């Protein structure tokens, strides 16, 4: 389900939700659009 | 059996010696007047305290 | 050829290597105070002709201890002000 | 301390090196000033 | 008689006051599941919101300090609330803490401004194309009212906070003392106290925003 | 008293160790200093063992005390 | 790979003290033991002046009145607010 | 003014630092995006 | 059937048996504070409808803490002398 | 099942400080480094008044004079005394 | 100005003074070999000697306290010597320690005397066959000068010790002060000081013997 | 008279006890006979 | 604490039980008195 | 020899030097004749 999962589980199911660490090494790892 | 000095140190020593001699003379000169005056003005103060307890015994 | 060595043996570059290979738990504090006491003991005392120096050291150490303890109350009577 | 470093030096590294180079200098200045002021008051009360 | 509450506490001869300061750290736990309970979802939303709001203007380079600013504001907004309680201590009103929290940031901003953009940072001392009659009488003012930044940046917060605690103590004392006399005056001052309490609940965050906003735009200038 | 024997024993080492430096070895000393600077700048002296650095620092402080000695003269 | 949660944990009395206390005490006095117990604890603290009364008392009273007002008026609103955020993330992803 | 009995400044400052630049930079560094 | 049990399970006679079967090293102090925090957390907080009581307790605890801290300076204004 | 002892352990200078120090220092200054080293350490302590002088100074001086008198006059007597007790137990058993 | 040396020390806000007291414990190590070094053989002989001397009179039951008495005397003889040094602390002159070391022993002796030998212990209040004219005026005196035991048993030692430290401090101070004036007076007072120092080396053990002898015979009576 | 600032009596007493009735009764309890 | 008990309860047992029964009572009396006196001075200074 | 031995080693070689613990449980485990 959803509640039984974590952020890494979303890395697992949706790689497009990935907050990549190269183009945005800092927090929140992406801009504020 | 003495061990000859490594020259580095023979150099480093007497230089610092005379540096400190100069430092000491400079300190003496620079410091004498301030203490002289602070103590003399404290002497004014203590004479004033003396006359105070003279009139406010 | 060894990870742990006498802190004098180890170098400055691997200094932290020594600092991190060694332990720190209070048991490892007693197991250090004991080693110090026993080095002193078995080197300067437990010998068939022990001398004054086999004892005078701890006395003149306790002295400096109790002098440091007291430094605060002694800054109030320095004979000269600007030292 | 290994757990300590692996909790507070994996994530917080890129910050202290790349960004915060300029705040540590300021903290050194802060130490300078606090030293100065504590010394001054210690002096003035040593008098009295 | 009443500066007591600002006296640094140690239940005995040991260093405690470093625990009055890390206590808030755990009224803001961290999540590990994806979904979580309420107390985390709420603060999470709150933070997304406040960031999206304040870090809009800054350029891309200047957008590296989000962590520092929001942590600063969170920490302070906690401390200044918690301090409200009956017998709690405000580790901010210790002026030293405020100085040590102000200076480094201001200095590091200025240093980013003079390491890069040297000529231009120097230039911000002379507003554009002012009358050439008065240049010195202006590049004195700007450069004196620069160094004035951190001092006020701290003292404002410090004394602002202090005054509220002091005023509530005194009003409650006069409340008891009038209760000695009569009844209705006590209720008057109690309602007064309720109003003051709310107003303090308010300033205690107003000042956090002020602080980390001042800083944000000081970075906007000298980035 | 026994001042003479040990005082002469000390003069023995004094006229060979309390001696000022000569204008001839100044080159050797300055060159050793520059070699120290070399070992320092690159970060190669950081391979030393402790005892050596301890010794170096203790003799450094030795040289240092003479500064306060000069103050004494002052 | 994570476990779920309950619907609501340990129920509580007065919103402050848990009930398990009460049940643990049921065998001997049943119901009206804990209440008088606390009343006595408190009248004791007050009588011997282990707790002297001053301005901070009334400050605490005011803060607490404010707080209970707030909760008793906004609680479930905030609860549904949060559950809404949760379901909203679920959907906006789902 | 007990904010001027300078005895305690060192610890107050150091602890402020320890907090403001360690713990929160751990917690908040873990918050997530929509 | 067990050496170590919940301190409530153990009896008074074997009380010292429990006191001596258990450990005391600071690691075993953190490994206790953690258990307390996590019992509280997973029992009153990490639930889908957490309430005030899930929080009010720690607040009204910190209160009493900082009250005890202050008892000394409050024995100087007791309204009545002989209590 | 026990080990024996030396005849006399680490020799010592001034009866207070060990010599190993001196040898460790031999390479660089050889002989007259440690002595001036200590002289400077001490003139420093005295000059900056890390050690102010008072009555307790002279009390320490007197106690130390007494002690050195005692030892330099009774040491070997006590040493042979003790070795005598040892040999005497050995014999009285043997 | 000078009661300082009796002020209880703590280098900081921590309980140190419980280390000034156990330090002696290791100037008297314990042997494991049969033969040993000097510093142990000496003290061993010393103790055999002093026991064989003092515990002669006591009966067989009363010969169970050898440990306590000789430990008492050893501990005190250490402390009161060590305290002589330039800047050392005498944990005895803290009167409380002396009371806590005196009372229990005296009380337990009296209690052994009244648990057994009841009639006879009661009887020691009336010396044998005194004039029957004055009985009360005698069984008042004996019973008041009994309870007076521990009080003096402690205070004597306490103040005896204290006075020496105080006197040496003062003599050395006046020594420096006269040195301001002239030379020979200083040497006069320094020799005086040497004499005093020896005399203190002496009393510091005389009093131990006194103490654990008083106690020994108090047990002799009420055994 | 600093022997009357009673604050410290508890610790002094307890430590005296700990010493006089533990350590020496260990050391001296090991001394031997001729 | 096992080393502690095996160093200070094997030898010192026959003393605390058989002999020293009568000194512990005295130490309790000592505690009584010290309590009384500390309380008295605490009272008298609470006044001033 | 002697110096290499201990009190227990004397228990071993001479049982008559034994300080018996029954008739004299206390210290010095025997009377003072
Ligand atoms: C009951 C009856 C009571 C009766 C009491 C009578 C005495 C009883 C028996 C005790 C005698 C002590 C034996 C002894 O002294 O050792 C020699 C004796 C001889 O040893 P050795 O190896 O065979 O030969 C050594 C040579 O004699 C070495 O000869 P040397 O030519 O090499 O001379 C070396 C000397 C010369 O070198 C120098 O010139 C150095 C000069 C610089 C001085 C140091 C710096 C000072 C700075 C200020 C100076 C300003 C001026 O170095 C020193 O100056 C050292 C002194 C430094 C101060 C240290 C003070 C420690 C004194 C310890 C003595 C213990 C006395 C206890 C008496 C009881 C209390 C009254 O040692 C032993 O054999 C066994 C020692 C057994 C000691 C027993 C201790 C029992 C436990 C006591 C605990 C309490 C401590 C009390 C402290 C106060
Ligand atoms: C940025 C924008 C800023 C805007 C600010 C506006 C607010 C923002 C959102 C925060 C709202 C807080 C949510 C809330 O209140 O929980 C309800 C809400 C409803 O929970 P529920 O389980 O679904 O339903 C509960 C029912 O409503 C339960 O209904 P009930 O009928 O059972 O009523 C029970 C009640 C009635 O029972 C009684 O009658 C007991 C009577 C005795 C009273 C106790 C003894 C007092 C002794 C003296 C009294 C003398 C008179 O029991 C009590 O009286 C408990 C009060 C005891 C005092 C404890 C005080 C803790 C207050 C915590 C509130 C947090 C407010 C933060 C606002 C920010 C600062 C302005 O809780 C949640 O769902 C999640 C809570 C999330 C909390 C967020 C906290 C964030 C971290 C803050 C850290 C700093 C702490 C600040 C401390 C100051």
Swiss-Prot record, chain B:
Protein's cellular compartments: Mitochondrion; Mitochondrion inner membrane
Gene Ontology biological process terms in this record: proton motive force-driven mitochondrial ATP synthesis
UniProt GO MF annotations: proton-transporting ATP synthase activity, rotational mechanism
Positions of post-translational N6-acetyllysine modification: 32
GO cellular component: mitochondrial inner membrane; proton-transporting ATP synthase complex
Keyword list, A-Z: Acetylation, ATP synthesis, CF(0), Hydrogen ion transport, Ion transport, Membrane, Mitochondrion, Mitochondrion inner membrane, Phosphoprotein, Transport
Assembly and binders: Component of the ATP synthase complex composed at least of ATP5F1A/subunit alpha, ATP5F1B/subunit beta, ATP5MC1/subunit c (homooctomer), MT-ATP6/subunit a, MT-ATP8/subunit 8, ATP5ME/subunit e, ATP5MF/subunit f, ATP5MG/subunit g, ATP5MK/subunit k, ATP5MJ/subunit j, ATP5F1C/subunit gamma, ATP5F1D/subunit delta, ATP5F1E/subunit epsilon, ATP5PF/subunit F6, ATP5PB/subunit b, ATP5PD/subunit d, ATP5PO/subunit OSCP.
Similarity comment: Belongs to the ATPase e subunit family.
Protein name per the record: ATP synthase F(0) complex subunit e, mitochondrial
Organism: Sus scrofa (Pig)
Native organism taxonomy: Eukaryota, Metazoa, Chordata, Craniata, Vertebrata
Section covered of the full-length record: 3 to 59 of 71
Swiss-Prot record, chains C, I:
Biological source species: Sus scrofa (Pig)
Compartmental location: Mitochondrion; Mitochondrion inner membrane
Name assigned to this protein: ATP synthase F(0) complex subunit f, mitochondrial
Classification lineage: Eukaryota, Metazoa, Chordata, Craniata, Vertebrata
Cellular component, GO, one term: proton-transporting ATP synthase complex
InterPro entries: F1F0-ATPsyn_F_prd
Residues recorded as bearing N6-acetyllysine in the entry: 11
Residues passing through the membrane, by range: 57-74
Subunit structure: Component of the ATP synthase complex composed at least of ATP5F1A/subunit alpha, ATP5F1B/subunit beta, ATP5MC1/subunit c (homooctomer), MT-ATP6/subunit a, MT-ATP8/subunit 8, ATP5ME/subunit e, ATP5MF/subunit f, ATP5MG/subunit g, ATP5MK/subunit k, ATP5MJ/subunit j, ATP5F1C/subunit gamma, ATP5F1D/subunit delta, ATP5F1E/subunit epsilon, ATP5PF/subunit F6, ATP5PB/subunit b, ATP5PD/subunit d, ATP5PO/subunit OSCP.
Physiological role: Subunit f, of the mitochondrial membrane ATP synthase complex (F(1)F(0) ATP synthase or Complex V) that produces ATP from ADP in the presence of a proton gradient across the membrane which is generated by electron transport complexes of the respiratory chain. ATP synthase complex consist of a soluble F(1) head domain - the catalytic core - and a membrane F(1) domain - the membrane proton channel. These two domains are linked by a central stalk rotating inside the F(1) region and a stationary peripheral stalk.
Swiss-Prot record, chains E, K:
Residue ranges the record marks as coiled coil: none
PROSITE patterns: ATPASE_A
Subcellular location, principal: mitochondrion
Record GO cellular component, one term: mitochondrial inner membrane
Segments passing through the bilayer: 3-23, 65-85, 94-114, 133-153, 161-181, 186-206
Subcellular location: Mitochondrion inner membrane
Pfam families recorded: ATP-synt_A
Keyword tags: ATP synthesis, CF(0), Hydrogen ion transport, Ion transport, Membrane, Mitochondrion, Mitochondrion inner membrane, Transmembrane, Transmembrane helix, Transport
Keyword Transmembrane helix on entry: yes
UniProt catalytic activity: H(+)(in) = H(+)(out)
Membrane topology: Multi-pass membrane protein
GO molecular function terms noted in the UniProt entry: proton channel activity
InterPro entries noted in UniProt: ATP_synth_F0_asu, ATP_synth_F0_asu_AS, ATP_synth_F0_asu_bact/mt, F0_ATP_A_sf
CDD domains to which the protein is assigned, alphabetical: ATP-synt_Fo_a_6 (cd00310)
Domain of life: Eukaryota
Record-level GO BP terms: proton motive force-driven ATP synthesis; proton transmembrane transport
Subunit composition and interactions: Component of the ATP synthase complex composed at least of ATP5F1A/subunit alpha, ATP5F1B/subunit beta, ATP5MC1/subunit c (homooctomer), MT-ATP6/subunit a, MT-ATP8/subunit 8, ATP5ME/subunit e, ATP5MF/subunit f, ATP5MG/subunit g, ATP5MK/subunit k, ATP5MJ/subunit j, ATP5F1C/subunit gamma, ATP5F1D/subunit delta, ATP5F1E/subunit epsilon, ATP5PF/subunit F6, ATP5PB/subunit b, ATP5PD/subunit d, ATP5PO/subunit OSCP.
Similarity field: Belongs to the ATPase A chain family.
PANTHER family, per database record: ATP SYNTHASE SUBUNIT A
Protein name: ATP synthase F(0) complex subunit a
Organism classification: Eukaryota, Metazoa, Chordata, Craniata, Vertebrata
Curated annotation (Swiss-Prot), chains H, L:
Lipid bilayer topology: Single-pass membrane protein
Record's subcellular location: Mitochondrion membrane
Membrane spanning residue stretches: 8-24
An annotated GO BP: proton motive force-driven ATP synthesis
Any one GO CC term of the record: proton-transporting ATP synthase complex
GO molecular function: proton transmembrane transporter activity
Keyword Cell division: no
Top-level lineage group: Eukaryota
Keywords: Acetylation, ATP synthesis, CF(0), Hydrogen ion transport, Ion transport, Membrane, Mitochondrion, Transmembrane, Transmembrane helix, Transport
Chief location: mitochondrion
Record function comment: Subunit 8, of the mitochondrial membrane ATP synthase complex (F(1)F(0) ATP synthase or Complex V) that produces ATP from ADP in the presence of a proton gradient across the membrane which is generated by electron transport complexes of the respiratory chain. ATP synthase complex consist of a soluble F(1) head domain - the catalytic core - and a membrane F(1) domain - the membrane proton channel. These two domains are linked by a central stalk rotating inside the F(1) region and a stationary peripheral stalk.
Family: Belongs to the ATPase protein 8 family.
The name this protein goes by in its record: ATP synthase F(0) complex subunit 8
Taxonomic source organism: Sus scrofa (Pig)
Lineage summary: Eukaryota, Metazoa, Chordata, Craniata, Vertebrata
Residues of the full protein shown: 1 to 34 of 67
């Amino acid at each position: 389900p959803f509640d039984q999962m974590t952020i890494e589980d979303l890395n697992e199911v949706f790689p497009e939700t990935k907050l990549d660490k190269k183009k945005y090494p800092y927090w929140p790892h992406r801009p504020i659009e | 059996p003495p061990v000859q000095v490594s020259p580095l140190i023979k150099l480093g020593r007497y230089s610092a010696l005379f540096l400190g001699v100069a430092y000491g003379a400079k300190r003496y000169n620079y410091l004498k007047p301030r203490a002289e005056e602070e103590r003399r003005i404290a002497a004014e103060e203590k004479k004033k305290q003396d006359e105070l307890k003279r009139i406010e015994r | 050829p060894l990870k742990d060595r006498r802190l004098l043996e180890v170098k400055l570059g691997e200094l932290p290597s020594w600092i991190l290979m060694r332990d720190f738990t209070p048991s490892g504090i007693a197991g250090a105070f004991q080693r110090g006491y026993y080095r002193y003991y078995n080197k300067y005392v437990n010998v068939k002709k022990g001398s004054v120096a086999g004892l005078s050291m701890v006395l003149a150490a306790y002295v400096v201890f109790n002098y440091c303890r007291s430094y605060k109350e002694l800054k109030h009577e320095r004979l000269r002000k600007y030292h | 301390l290994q757990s300590l470093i692996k909790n507070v030096w994996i994530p917080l590294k890129p910050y202290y090196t790349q960004v915060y180079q300029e705040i540590w200098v300021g903290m050194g200045l802060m130490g300078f000033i606090v030293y100065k002021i504590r010394s001054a008051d210690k002096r003035s009360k040593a008098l009295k | 008689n009443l500066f007591a509450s600002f006296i640094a506490p140690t239940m005995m001869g040991l260093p405690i006051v470093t625990l009055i300061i890390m206590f808030p750290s755990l009224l803001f736990p961290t999540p590990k599941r994806l979904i979580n309970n309420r107390t985390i979802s709420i603060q999470q939303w709150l933070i997304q919101l406040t960031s999206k709001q304040m870090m809009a203007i800054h350029n891309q380079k200047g957008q590296t300090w989000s962590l520092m600013l929001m942590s600063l504001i969170m920490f302070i907004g906690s401390t200044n609330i918690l301090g409200l309680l009956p017998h709690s201590f405000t580790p901010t009103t210790q002026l030293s803490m405020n100085l040590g929290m102000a200076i480094p940031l201001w200095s590091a901003t200025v240093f980013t401004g003079f390491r890069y953009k040297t000529k231009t940072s120097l230039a911000h001392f002379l507003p554009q194309g002012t009358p050439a009659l008065l240049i010195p009488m202006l590049v004195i003012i700007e450069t004196i009212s620069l160094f004035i930044q951190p001092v006020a940046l701290a003292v404002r917060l410090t004394a602002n906070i202090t005054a509220g605690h002091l005023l509530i103590h005194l009003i409650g004392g006069a409340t008891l003392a009038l209760l000695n006399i009569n009844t209705m005056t006590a209720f008057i001052t109690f309602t007064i106290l309720i109003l003051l309490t709310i107003l303090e609940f308010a300033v205690a965050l107003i000042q956090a925003y002020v602080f980390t906003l001042l800083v944000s735009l000081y970075l906007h200038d000298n980035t | 008293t026994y001042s003479k024997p040990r005082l002469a024993t000390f003069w023995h080492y004094a006229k060979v160790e309390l001696v000022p430096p000569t204008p001839a070895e100044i080159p050797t000393a300055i060159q050793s200093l520059k070699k120290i600077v070399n070992s320092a700048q690159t970060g190669s002296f950081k391979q030393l063992t402790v005892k050596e650095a301890l010794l170096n620092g203790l003799v450094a402080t030795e040289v240092l005390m003479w500064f306060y000695v000069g103050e004494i003269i002052a | 790979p994570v476990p779920p949660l309950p619907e609501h944990g340990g129920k509580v009395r007065l919103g402050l003290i848990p009930e398990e206390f009460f049940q643990f005490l049921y065998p001997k006095t049943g119901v009206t033991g804990p209440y008088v117990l606390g009343t006595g604890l408190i009248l004791y603290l007050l009588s011997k002046e282990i707790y002297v009364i001053t301005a901070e008392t009334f400050s605490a009273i005011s803060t607490i009145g404010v707080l209970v007002y707030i909760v008793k008026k906004y609680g479930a609103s905030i609860g549904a607010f949060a559950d809404k955020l949760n379901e909203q993330k679920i959907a906006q992803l789902e | 003014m007990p904010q001027l009995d300078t005895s305690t400044w060192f610890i107050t400052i150091t602890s402020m630092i320890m907090t403001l630049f360690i713990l929160f930079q751990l917690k908040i560094s873990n918050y997530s995006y929509p």
